[PDB]
Amino acid sequence: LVFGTQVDDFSTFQECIFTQFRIILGDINFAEIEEANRVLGPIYFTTFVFFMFFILLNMFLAIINDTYSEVKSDLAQQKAEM
Amino acid sequence: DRGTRATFIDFSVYNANINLFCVVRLLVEFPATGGVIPSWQFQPLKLIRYVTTFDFFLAACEIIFCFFIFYYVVEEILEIRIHKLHYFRSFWNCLDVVIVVLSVVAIGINIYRTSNVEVLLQFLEDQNTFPNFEHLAYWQIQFNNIAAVTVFFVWIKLFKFINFNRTMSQLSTTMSRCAKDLFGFAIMFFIIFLAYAQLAYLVFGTQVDDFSTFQECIFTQFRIILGDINFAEIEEANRVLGPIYFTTFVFFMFFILLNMFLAIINDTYSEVKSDLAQQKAEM
Amino acid sequence: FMFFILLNMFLAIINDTYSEVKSDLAQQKAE
Amino acid sequence: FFVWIKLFKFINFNRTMSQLSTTMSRCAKDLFGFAIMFFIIFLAYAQLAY
């Protein structure tokens, strides 16, 4: 909705999705994002980067870590106990 | 002359194929210290909406949206008038009032910029005169911003209903339990981030063109986390305190703070999962 | 898939073995 | 180079470096086993892209 007319990376919805995926890889320009909308443009970038990386990557890692620990503990307990 | 500070050029176009006006503005700024700074804007606004049936459909949808907003505000005020005179310790009611306020502002702006279209009528009388279509573009930009933020917040409101199965309850429980500690550590994270930003602004803020403003410093430091930095202008700006700042920032920020966030989330997730498992196995 | 799943499996294995080593060395005290 | 590596290993008389050395030695088999799955998925994606 914000950058849909004057960026060409957010021209279409799927293009927005792929641009966000590339942003996760740190392949952003940010030269056109800021100049397209001086306000509400940088806010998007900062909030997205912070929330996405910190909270969501840490939660994805934590789920797998806890599951692996539980599985190893269970498989260790089921052995040498019969 | 040497005393000129700014220059504006303005015009507009129609493109009768798809009914969509476009206002073009070009600005050239001459600062007191010399040089030239160009800027531009091209706003594709529309003023002759009701020409086709799809526009009638959109108008009907807007009317339905207004009725929905009226119903939501009536039910919210009915709830607040008698039930739960405090009402604010849920985090799902501040979102409701934010959505209602933003939608009311959007409706007001839309009415204001739809009733005030006499400039087009004035222009259509004498077509050999400059059409003044700047206020319409400004209000269109404002309305677009308001609509964008409202649409963003509605999808966040959607979270209230994804709690159907047990495997989705523990994730929401973990998030709600860890939000307080996440905010507590985010305070310190932001304090250190702003200290680094102000140091960079004061040191490299006159030569690098990437730290020329505090906002630019903040954006550059967020981009450094992405690995979207060149490592050049910092070092050719200052061979000492140039790489020192970069190395210390990367080390401290990445390692300490990212791992601390991970630890905070992981510990509470494991605690919640173990508590739920024990409760289920003991009942 | 690659980034999330596998880059998290790597660190899950490393963290599990590191915590196991730490706990094993911690339980050695006070016998 | 080998003597320097061996001295660095012998410089692990402190608890922290000994813990680090033990950590990476008790999980070598699992760490190598996971690489097999990683490479299988990587080669599948490489074949699809090719």
Next chain:
Amino acid sequence: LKSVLRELVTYLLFLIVLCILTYGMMSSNVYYYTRMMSQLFLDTPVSK
């Protein structure tokens, strides 16, 4: 663990002695000769 500690100390001393011998095998008075042989010998203008 007194015997183990003594053995470790002896091994560390032996390793230090071996490292010192290896460093001495890389003694000086050869860098200048190598530089002269690589920059002057077999590498010089035919004439002026």
Next chain:
Amino acid sequence: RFVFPEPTADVNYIVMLTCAVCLVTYMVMAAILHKLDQLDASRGRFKYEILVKTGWGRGSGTTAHVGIMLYGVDSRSGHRHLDGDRAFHRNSLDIFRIATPHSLGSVWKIRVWHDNKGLSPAWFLQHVIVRDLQTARSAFFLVNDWLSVETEANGGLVAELQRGFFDKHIWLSIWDRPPRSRFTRIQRATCCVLLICLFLGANAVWYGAVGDSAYSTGHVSRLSPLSVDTVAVGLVSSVVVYPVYLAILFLFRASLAHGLSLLLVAVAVAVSGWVGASFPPGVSVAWLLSSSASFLASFLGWEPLKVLLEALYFSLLFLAKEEARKVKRLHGMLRSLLVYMLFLLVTLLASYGDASCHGHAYRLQSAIKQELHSRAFLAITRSEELWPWMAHVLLPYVHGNQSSPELGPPRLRQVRLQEALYPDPPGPRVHTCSAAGGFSTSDYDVGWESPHNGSGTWAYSAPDLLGAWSWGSCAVYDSGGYVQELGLSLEESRDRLRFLQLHNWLDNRSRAVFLELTRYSPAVGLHAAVTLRLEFPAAGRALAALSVRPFALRRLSAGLSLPLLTSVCLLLFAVHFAVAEARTWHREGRWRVLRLGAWARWLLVALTAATALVRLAQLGAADRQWTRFVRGRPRRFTSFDQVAQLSSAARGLAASLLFLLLVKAAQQLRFVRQWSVFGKTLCRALPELLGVTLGLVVLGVAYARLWGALRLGAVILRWRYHALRGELYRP
């Protein structure tokens, strides 16, 4: 006489920073004071621990409560209520032991009184028998008499003043609250912040709005306290606040005043900002001095005056030890927060006073680089391409036509090294600077070396003591070399050039050309030192560099500018810190190693001293250079190239000090109960993280990011966090 002036659009950062600091200190002080007063309701030495059984009291067998006010120097005691398990059973000698926190000198300091709860004793009790337990501060002896019945016996072997001396002083009455006073802290901190904000507003409205009293005061008088505008206005404006101040104070003794005070603070801050956003740089220093003088005068003189006037008008065990020591820690924190806030305000004023000048300097340097075609100059390799560039873009720029304020003709000082440079032999295009030799310190004649009778037109021009060092990519240069002036106007400069490439001035021996000039921008009032360097590693290779440093030429002779005040304040702070740390060193002794401690206090002291010293050196150098430039002026080219470097160094040092202060505040945030697990976790695992990363970097060095995708510190941090959470949350 109100004007509603300044329709101008500008921002004054000094007033905003001062108000923000004065509000933040109150915001952080309120929490500490509230925490301290939560335990004040819980509570509500000078003698020995012996029984106080009556030995001279008989006939009146009943229960009665008495209180002994152990008056002392800077140690108030009060009275303690007497109770007992048997409710002070009648026909018995009441024995107890009550001592107040007061620990006055071991002299006759006591004032006892007995309440007449019904029956009263004709005689008097001897005393509370006590000789010495720890201090023996209050004497205990019989009196065999007393005052009139149903009254207070004269305690002997001024009172009105001492009872309300330091607790009616408001300012220093925060940590002197009477145990049963109902003027608890919240009402003693709101009055102080209100008074400070009203002082700021009343002193700002005088300089900004009401400054046209028949055009009474000039607005030009010196900033120094010369019995003038700076000091008299503080005294005059210290009395205007007192009506409303005393109104709010006597309203405090319902809860309405707690909102009126905040409203007054808010409106005062808003008015201060609005009327000060147009302050010239020479008044914001006067405003600060006036406010400080008003505060000092008000406090020191007229708080004792108020208490004296009021007094004259009036005249005509584990729990105790563990909850009585926390008060001392709270008082220490209270008295350290003010010092930290003063230091932070001083640093903020030192570093962030001219941010608009910062932006203007960036824009000006960008414009200067753009106007000189820096891209063309940088991409130079031929030693002869310099002349077309100078003839095309330099000479029309320095002279121009009603453009480019120059402030001193340019110079072309060059170094010779008096040795023919060997051309680089073909090969892999080595990136070194070989073929180096000794320099030249001789005098030649027209053309080249030919001393006929005396020194020729090409002299050495020996460098000065303070001339800055270029620090190029091949060596380090100084302010010495063969200088050549580029004329005065665009008629002789062309001939000078034609001479310079007519008689091979730049032969195949030279090293650099060092083209240098200055620039001035009066719209923003900023100077700019511009230098251009052409290194000559070999014959006809060259390396192009340019440096445009903008700065503000402020001199030590200008008076009492803000940098001087900030520098002297920083010097005072550094001296205080050094004295305190030296006293700590002397009392403790030695062996203060393997800790942050002195190894951090000394670093802080060194940084604080260095910032002020560098700023003072910059001011002195600017003054000397400007005084040298003024004397004479035409075709001498006094160089301002070392003032800019000193200014940059001072700015960097101030930024580093501010960053250190902010980090210290961030780590001092840990005082919240539920937020204390963050600092503790980091302070325990940080040495381990440093050790492991140091052991890892040497692993990659012996071979010949690191954890940007490995995240090893997450394991240690999680283990420490879980351990501390278990050790804290449960027990």
